[PDB]
Amino acid sequence: MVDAFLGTWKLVDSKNFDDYMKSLGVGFATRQVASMTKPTTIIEKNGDILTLKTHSTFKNTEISFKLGVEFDETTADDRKVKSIVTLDGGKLVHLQKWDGQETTLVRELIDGKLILTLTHGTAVCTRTYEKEA
Numbered sequence: 026m027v028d029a030f031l032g033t034w035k036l037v038d039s040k041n042f043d044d045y046m047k048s049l050g051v052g053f054a055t056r057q058v059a060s061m062t063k064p065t066t067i068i069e070k071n072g073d074i075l076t077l078k079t080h081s082t083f084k085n086t087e088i089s090f091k092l093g094v095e096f097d098e099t100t101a102d103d104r105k106v107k108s109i110v111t112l113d114g115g116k117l118v119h120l121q122k123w124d125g126q127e128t129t130l131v132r133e134l135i136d137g138k139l140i141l142t143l144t145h146g147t148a149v150c151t152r153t154y155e156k157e158a
């Protein structure tokens with residue numbers, strides 16, 4: 026179900042990421058470096074466990090989860106959240122909850138590119154990844 030998302034992906038476009046980070050309370054210096062960073066995202070499965078790595082010259086993260094099963098997560102900006110990832114309309118939807126707040130990280134495939142839409146508050150960021158061979 027999740028197989029077309031699997032592999033290694035490289036950031037090739039970013040819109041409104043500063044808006045998104047600022048909504049989350051990320052400090053100006055972190056936003057400044059992040060705005061010039063191009064992460065690599067690696068999505069792997071082993072049975073129904075998915076592992077999603079984000080690698081960069083600035084911050085690295087890694088999460089493992091089962092679709093539809095809540096997990097604890099500590100984000101790149103150091104939020105401690107309750108998370109769930111599910112498939113919805115063919116999109117990989119990651120919902121994070123903390124302190125009554127929520128953010129969604131939605132991944133979809135369009136013309137072979139991986140489009141990540143990040144929403145928090147009114148901020149909507151779109152980041153595009155292309156697949157590495």
Ligand SMILES: CCCCCCCCCCCCCCC(=O)O
Pocket residue numbers: 036046051055059062064066079081083084085100101102141152
């Ligand atoms: C990984 C780049 C550094 C961002 C660090 C501070 C903001 C983190 C915000 C939450 C995570 C965003 C992930 C964006 C993405 O995977 O392209």
